[PDB]
């Protein structure tokens, strides 16, 4: 229907064209008949009838008189919904300035008329005159005259000039402006001005003037002479129970405006002193600004409830505004909500749904099927049949939901796994039954959690749920590619208990034909689950090339391991099961099954694994008791020793040998050491036992303690938890950060007294409050990240570029932080991977690195490679499939139309809550910084070189001595300037000292061309470089944190990308969170989209203009095709917020934040939104240009091009 949206100033003619009449009275309704009053705020003659196809008289009342005007009323006989569309207008007695174009800094009126804002307010507030027409007089336009001064120059000239007051004077000044002549004057001054600040002033004013000239808008339209009036149904006055009425504040504001306007007309008719007219005009201006934006101009008007009235701007802006409460988020039909229980009998694609809830949700479908099969003649018969709850109604409901997927959601929805499609199974009850294996995806536990359910209606939605949203499809984490349906808690405990090993168990040493005989022996009580036996195992290997090789052989194992092998699918080695199985082992099993067998086998294997784990956890009988918290006997003696030597050191302190701070520090150190030793002793005591084998010798065996098993299996609990249960709680902190000298020496088994519990609460309250605030901080960060990268959609397949990023293993000392396989898995190479020391091509170009090629790279010991990356992609809009690589949640190459930006933002934002020289290797030494490389050629040590046993190329042996988390992420993504940034080298030249000016110091640099540049360095700066030294561009002058803008400006795009990626991955890796770096690269690409045009060329671009990058790239391509002067640019780095507010579409920017500023800018400029991104299409109800709708939008630009 429509293809674009414009915005711009509204002329009085346009407002009159919108209006269906003029509101002349503040009347709303009659107090007796409750009917609309004529020429009022709710007039039926202006806005339409109150009843459908009726008029206020009652003479024309049926549909026969549609479209006729009641000659004695004027009410058009039509539908009442026209009262939601028909607008009115008020003819203001005096012009009123628009509040948005006056007080939203920068003031458009202010810099169009090149005079300060306070001057304009003084004129508007009726305090100072302005000369509009100077005539044959020395006065100049815009010069202010006081009242007495005004009479002086009136009596000394007369009618030769004109001086006025108020918004009328501003309108006269703005209407007489000759915009082209002003523009020419600004350009001429711009060329001939030598001050850059003045240049910024003039370029702003010239941009605004040229925007006015090109958009066709006129400046005088910023002053309102006709005020539009909203339709009554959007500002309702409706009755409540008991005769009370509910109204909107817009009614009060409009009534105030109308009353003051009518009083102004009355005062202009009955000739009044100028003071009264001036006061009335002030009131009119104040009322209009309050209606448009309450509280901006001054004190906000309050209603009868003593709270500020909320205006149109408040109704379009804010968290509770129309954009965010009703457009980007809505309440929907065919939805339900219930508490969630656990269904251990369900499959991965099934969810338990209550019968009553499904009956309510699927009511129209039941009606349709009852009508189709003939059990109901009409729809009311079906309604009563459903309400009476017959049996055939239940059969119809069974057949309706037979293959109708349903969407389950849990709030908050941090990532896309928070909503999934399941097949419903009707259960008698009131709670939704959820499969355990999906709980980790929902972050759901059964302590009172509630989930929402939604019913897709059309066939497209059902197939999207079945293909994309089905729980069986989403079993890989899109953030890292690891499985998300890994078992936890009782499944892990059962698989651990079944796979443990015991000495001298019943049936030890027996020979078994296979897993079936092991199960038979277990069921007959011949052998225990932990008996060490020999089993004949037939094992099939599927190789990388697909070869299927089966080998049968005798393996030493346990009974439980064979019974678990009974369910393992063919194609996996037995070594994956011939061990005790913790959480990591089961995760490895699932990963291997996915990598070598596929998806269906993985789902079946996971279901069988969780069945078996639950069954044998139930059969184990694992229980927690007070005797399982064994407290080592060494704890009491060690506490006694620590206390005695505390007494000794306190006595020594009384002798004055050491100070108080030293005593505090060493007491803390001894208490930390005592805690560590007590924890170690408790772990050693708890982790082992002594048994008797078949020979009678005492043997050392792993303990079967319940808490030890829980902690070691990874089901729940860690070493620290056991330490507080059975050892020492340790040192706790005073709530300002300081650590109390005395620690807690009692665990939870023995119990604490009053002060120990008080110190515990000190930290408990802080932890709770920190979680509460950090959740909101992470939510705001993820909102910003979603909005900055919402436009990124895979639009092509190959972008035809040669650029790429060079990747190496990360080294932060003498050990690796991440292997090259982890970083290179799922990417596409840019240039051919040549084998080191050889010219052969091991890996060709444009090939995806899967596990096989990763193992190849690991075998051939490649240190550095280079692959395609999103930021280096040169697609005009979005990115291409090759530059993005593998889709982590799917395992293959990313499909066209994938919203990679939203996935990236969710992946980064989801773990926000979890947030807060001796050589060691044998090899050679290389200098660049110091590098130590093994004989294979992999650089495995990177060390700093402050300004050495071995020189360059000298071999070094082992042991030779050559010699705050989430705020940090937010600051990195906002590109915040450090408080004390490191000063960098602007250009490669020789350093020299300069004149030490008072206050702060100056330095000079001499370039290769002999030009000298002066740098302004503060006094309190540690200066590193020395005079006469040629420092390269980007060298550190003063140490400190590096600003991202500086490294982008001086070093390059790859440098800033690497910096941001490394910092973000460091903060996410300290907490042990796995996030792929392509998401960060997408965010960085969205951070690099603008450019300051330096060399203007001739493509219409002012110097110093912040244009957007791909427009320049396209324009440069056309210019090259024309062989005519191209343009040169410098790329800027903008934070996610600033980049979001700087996007081309004004709808998305308005919906994000700062709606008033964005709307004012767009309206003055006359912007045009073409609806290319996700958010605008979401707001206007159209299909998003991503995923299933992508092709549809493509067809649109197939039509617009033709």
């Amino acid at each position: 229907e429509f293809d674009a949206i414009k915005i711009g100033l509204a002329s009085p003619d346009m407002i009159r064209s919108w209006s269906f009449g003029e509101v002349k009275k503040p009347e709303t309704i009659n107090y007796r008949t409750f009917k609309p009053e004529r020429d009022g705020l709710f007039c039926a003659r202006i806005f339409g009838p109150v009843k459908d196809y009726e008029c206020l008289c009652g003479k024309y009342k049926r549909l026969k008189h549609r479209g006729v005007i009641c000659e004695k009323c004027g009410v058009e006989v039509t539908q009442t919904k026209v009262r939601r569309d028909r607008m009115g207008h008020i003819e203001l007695a005096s012009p009123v300035a628009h509040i948005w174009f006056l007080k939203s800094l920068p003031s458009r009126i202010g810099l169009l008329m090149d005079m300060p804002l306070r001057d304009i307010e003084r004129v508007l507030y009726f305090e100072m005159y302005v000369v509009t027409e100077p005539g044959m007089t020395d006065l100049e336009r815009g010069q202010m005259l006081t009242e007495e001064e005004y009479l002086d120059r009136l009596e000394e000239w007369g009618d030769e000039f004109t001086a006025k007051m108020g918004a009328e004077a501003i309108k006269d000044l703005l209407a007489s402006m000759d915009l082209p002549a002003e523009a020419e004057q600004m350009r001429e001054e711009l060329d001939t001005t030598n001050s850059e600040t003045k240049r910024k002033k003039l370029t702003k004013r010239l941009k605004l003037v040229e925007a006015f000239v090109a958009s066709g808008n006129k400046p005088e339209w910023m002053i309102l002479t006709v005020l539009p009036v909203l339709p009554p149904d959007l500002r309702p006055l409706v009755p409540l129970d008991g005769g009370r009425f509910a109204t909107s504040d817009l009614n009060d504001l409009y009534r105030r405006v109308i009353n003051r306007n009518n009083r102004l007309k009355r005062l202009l008719e009955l000739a009044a002193p100028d003071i009264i007219v001036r006061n009335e005009k002030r009131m009119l201006q104040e009322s209009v600004d309050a209606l448009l934006d309450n509280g901006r101009r001054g004190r906000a008007i309050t209603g009868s409830n003593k709270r500020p009235l909320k205006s149109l701007a408040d109704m379009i802006k804010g968290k509770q505004g129309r954009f965010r409460q009703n457009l980007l988020g809505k309440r929907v039909d065919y939805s339900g909500r219930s508490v969630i229980t656990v269904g251990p009998y369900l499959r991965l694609h099934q969810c338990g749904l209550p019968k009553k809830m499904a009956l309510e949700l699927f009511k129209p479908f039941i009606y349709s099927k009852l009508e189709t099969r003939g059990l109901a003649t009409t729809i009311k018969a079906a309604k009563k049949m459903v309400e009476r709850e017959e049996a055939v109604v239940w059969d119809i409901l069974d057949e309706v939901i037979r293959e109708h997927p349903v969407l389950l959601n849990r709030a908050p929805t941090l990532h896309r796994l928070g909503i999934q499609a399941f097949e419903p199974v009707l259960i008698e009850g009131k709670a939704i039954q959820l499969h355990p294996l999906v709980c980790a995806a929902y972050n759901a536990d059964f302590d009172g959690d509630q989930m929402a359910v939604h019913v897709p209606l059309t066939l497209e939605a059902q197939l999207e749920a079945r293909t994309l949203m089905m729980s069986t499809n989403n079993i890989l984490s899109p953030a890292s590619g690891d499985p998300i349906i890994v078992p936890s808690q009782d499944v892990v405990l059962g698989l651990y208990y079944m796979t443990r090993e015991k000495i001298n168990a019943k049936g030890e040493g027996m020979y078994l034909t296979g897993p079936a005989e092991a199960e038979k022996a277990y069921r007959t009580k011949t052998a225990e689950l932990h008996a060490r036996v020999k089993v004949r195992i037939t094992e099939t290997i599927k190789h990388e090339n697909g070869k299927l090789t089966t080998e049968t052989k005798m393996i030493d194992t346990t009974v439980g391991r064979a019974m678990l092998w009974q369910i393992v699918p063919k194609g996996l080695p037995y070594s994956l099961v011939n061990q005790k199985l913790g959480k990591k082992q089961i995760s490895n099993l699932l990963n291997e099954a996915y990598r070598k067998l596929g998806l269906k086998d993985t789902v079946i294997f996971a279901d069988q694994i969780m069945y078996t784990g639950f069954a044998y956890a139930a059969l184990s009988g694992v229980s927690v008791g007070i005797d399982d918290m064994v407290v080592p006997a060494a704890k009491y003696t060690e506490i006694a020793e620590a206390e005695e030597e505390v007494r000794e050191i306190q006595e020594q302190f009384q002798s004055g040998l050491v100070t108080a701070g030293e005593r505090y520090n060493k007491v803390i150190d001894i208490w930390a050491s005592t805690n560590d030793r007590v924890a170690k002793a408790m772990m050693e005591n708890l982790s082992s036992e002594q048994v008797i084998n078949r020979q009678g010798e005492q043997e050392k065996q792993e303990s079967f303690n319940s808490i030890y098993m829980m902690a070691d299996s990874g089901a729940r609990g860690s070493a620290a938890q056991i330490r507080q249960l059975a050892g020492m709680r340790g040192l706790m902190a005073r709530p300002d950060g300081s650590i109390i000298e005395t620690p807690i020496t009692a665990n939870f088994k023995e119990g604490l007294n009053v002060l120990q519990y008080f110190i515990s609460t000190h930290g408990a309250r802080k932890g709770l409050a920190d979680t509460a605030l950090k959740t909101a901080n992470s939510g705001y960060l993820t909102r910003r990240l979603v909005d900055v990268a919402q436009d990124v959609v895979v639009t092509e397949h190959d972008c035809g570029t040669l650029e790429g990023v060079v990747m190496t293993p990360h080294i932060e000392g003498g050990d690796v932080k991440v292997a090259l396989t982890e970083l290179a898995l799922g990417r596409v190479v840019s240039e051919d991977i040549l084998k080191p020391g050889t010219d052969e091509v091991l890996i060709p170009r444009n090939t995806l690195l899967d596990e096989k090629w990763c193992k190849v790279i690991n075998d051939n010991s490649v240190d550095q490679i280079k692959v395609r990356s999103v930021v280096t992609c040169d697609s005009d809009f979005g990115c291409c499939a090759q530059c993005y690589g593998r889709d982590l949640a799917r395992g293959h190459l990313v499909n066209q139309g994938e919203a990679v930006g939203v996935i990236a933002a969710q992946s980064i934002g989801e773990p926000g809550t979890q947030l807060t020289i001796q050589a060691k290797n044998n090899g050679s030494v290389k200098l660049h910084e110091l590098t130590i490389i093994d004989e294979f050629g992999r650089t495995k040590e990177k060390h700093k070189l402050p300004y050495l046993s071995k020189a360059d190329g000298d071999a070094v042996a082992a042991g030779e001595t050559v010699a705050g988390g989430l705020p940090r992420v937010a600051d990195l993504f906002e590109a915040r300037k450090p408080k004390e940034p490191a000063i960098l080298a602007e250009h490669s030249g020789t350093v020299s000292f300069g004149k030490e000016t008072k206050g702060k110091r100056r330095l000079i640099i001499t370039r290769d061309s002999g030009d000298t540049y002066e740098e302004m360095i503060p006094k309190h700066r540690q200066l590193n470089v020395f005079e006469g030294e040629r420092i390269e561009r980007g060298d550190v002058i003063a140490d400190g944190p590096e600003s991202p803008h500086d490294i982008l400006r001086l070093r390059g795009i790859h440098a800033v990308t690497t910096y941001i990626a490394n910092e973000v991955q460091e903060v996410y890796r300290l907490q042990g969170v796995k996030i792929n770096d392509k998401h960060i690269e997408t965010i960085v690409r969205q951070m690099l989209r603008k450019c300051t045009i330096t060399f203007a060329g001739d493509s219409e671009f002012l110097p110093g203009e912040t244009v957007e990058y791909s427009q320049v790239k396209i324009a440069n391509r056309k210019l090259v095709e024309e062989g005519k002067e191209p343009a040169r640019f410098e790329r800027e780095l903008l934070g996610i917020t600033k980049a979001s507010l700087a996007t081309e579409s004004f709808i998305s920017a308005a919906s994000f934040q700062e709606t008033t500023r964005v709307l004012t800018e767009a309206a003055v400029s006359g912007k045009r939104d073409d609806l290319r991104g996700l958010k605008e299409n979401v707001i206007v109800g159209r299909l998003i240009p991503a995923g299933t709708g992508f092709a549809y939008h493509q067809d649109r630009q197939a039509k617009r091009a033709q």
Partner: protein, 468 residues
């Protein structure tokens, strides 16, 4: 330095000193002097006195209101009849000697002067005062427009020289025609339009019989008088602005803001000065307080409610509140409606009707809940919507009616359809349904009865039965 308009308003009104008694008398004397000059200027008009005389002729015949004719008598129908008879006699004497003895003769001038003196001893109602003002204002404005059109057409010095006596005389036209300057060709061409303009002027001058100088002098005198009176009244109100704000303070927090009350009090005070009298010997504050009070109270009663309550019902509510407070103080509990009805001398039903309609509609942003995010407005239903099941039922009913009527004969189904208005814009009664083929009404009735008779057959009526 400030953004509140109230403070700027007080700054502006505080720059003028406060007046005393003698200042009030001086300003009132200036107003009366201006009014007297305006009355004297208008009295020098041949059409003014006849209007007053005929108005008195109608009034004395007991056919018109006496108050509408005059409002008072200046003293330095017992008495009005004699004065108006004297005025009529002097008008007859003046008409006898207006032109027979000569316009420049002393008799006419003396008669006009004494007519002015007689008319100065009159206080006319402002209505016909402004009515006579407007006619001469329109005549002067039309003369100005014609003169400016002539000036624009001709464009000089010759017109200025002959403007005193030959502005509209044909001698100016004859001399222009006689002139032979190089630019007189286009002037002669425009002489046709100038002739039309002066012909239009002849009717005005014969209506006035004053040529050009006399009407100009009258207009100048009237303008001077009105300007002087306006200046005096403006000074007087600028003085009393402080009384306005002092009185308007007492009625705040009644739905209207302070500045609006101040402006309404200002309007009421201007009305007060429009009818102030200083001969009574009473100061201005006493008279002005009543008018400021009435303006403020009327504005509050008319503009302080979303749903307007008439003034009389506002008074009823206020008196009910006062009596309720008195009874509450007297017995110690809220007075029940019967007791208030007995006290207020009205039936109980009227008291209840007053009670229910004294409410002020609530806001839709009232915080409903501990968390301020929720509001009342989001818990309001839309009662005008049609339930989807009802729309589906309507569609099914249309389909079933079509199916039932399709099993009926063409003529007969047409009769039913275009009697009940099915699939057509309007409905038809028996007459136009008859006018199709058979104009007789009774056959249409009988065929419709046959329609219903076959339509209640169980073989073809089961489907429509389920819709009840």
């Amino acid at each position: 330095r400030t953004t509140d308009p109230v403070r700027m308003y007080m700054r502006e009104m505080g720059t003028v000193e406060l007046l005393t008694r003698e200042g009030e008398i001086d300003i009132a004397k200036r107003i009366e002097d201006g009014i007297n000059q305006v009355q004297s200027a208008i009295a020098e008009y041949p059409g003014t006195i006849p209007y007053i005389l005929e108005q008195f002729d109608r009034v004395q015949a007991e056919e018109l209101r006496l108050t509408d004719l005059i409002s008072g008598f200046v003293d330095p129908p017992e008495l009005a009849r004699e004065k108006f008879n004297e005025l009529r006699g002097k008008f007859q004497n003046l008409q006898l000697a207006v032109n027979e003895f000569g316009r420049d003769s002393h008799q006419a001038s003396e008669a006009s002067d004494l007519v002015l003196d007689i008319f100065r001893e009159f206080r006319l109602t402002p209505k016909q005062f402004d009515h006579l003002v407007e006619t001469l204002r329109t005549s002067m404005d039309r003369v100005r427009t014609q003169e400016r059109l002539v000036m624009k057409a001709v464009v000089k010095k010759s017109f200025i020289a002959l403007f005193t006596g030959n502005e509209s005389n044909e001698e100016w036209l004859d001399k222009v025609l006689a002139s032979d300057k190089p630019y007189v060709a286009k002037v002669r061409e425009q002489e046709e339009e100038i002739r039309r303009s002066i012909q239009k002027l002849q009717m005005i001058e014969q209506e006035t019989s004053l040529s050009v100088e006399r009407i100009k002098d009258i207009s100048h005198r009237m303008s001077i008088g009105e300007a002087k009176a306006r200046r005096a009244k403006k000074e007087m109100v600028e003085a009393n602005l402080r009384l306005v704000i002092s009185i308007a303070k007492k009625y705040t927090n009644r739905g209207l803001q302070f500045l609006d009350l101040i402006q309404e009090g200002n309007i009421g005070l201007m009305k007060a000065v429009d009818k102030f009298e200083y001969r009574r010997g009473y100061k201005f504050s006493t008279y002005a307080t009543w008018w400021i009070r009435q303006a403020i109270t009327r504005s509050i009663a008319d503009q302080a409610r979303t749903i307007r309550i008439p003034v009389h019902m506002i008074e009823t509510i206020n008196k009910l509140n006062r009596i309720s407070r008195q009874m509450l103080q007297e017995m110690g509990r809220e007075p029940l409606p019967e007791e208030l009805a007995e006290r207020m001398q009205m039936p109980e039903d009227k008291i209840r009707k007053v009670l229910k309609i004294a409410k002020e509609p609530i806001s839709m942003e009232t915080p409903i809940g501990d968390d301020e995010d929720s509001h009342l407005g989001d818990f309001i239903e839309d009662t005008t919507l049609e339930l989807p099941l009802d729309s589906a039922t309507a569609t099914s009913l249309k389909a079933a009616t079509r199916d039932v009527l399709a099993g009926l004969t063409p003529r007969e189904a047409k009769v039913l359809r275009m009697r009940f208005g099915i699939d057509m814009n309007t409905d038809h009664t028996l007459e136009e349904v008859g006018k199709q083929f058979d104009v007789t009404r009774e056959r249409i009735r009988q065929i419709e009865a046959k329609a219903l008779r076959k339509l209640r057959h169980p073989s073809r009526s089961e489907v429509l039965r389920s819709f009840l």
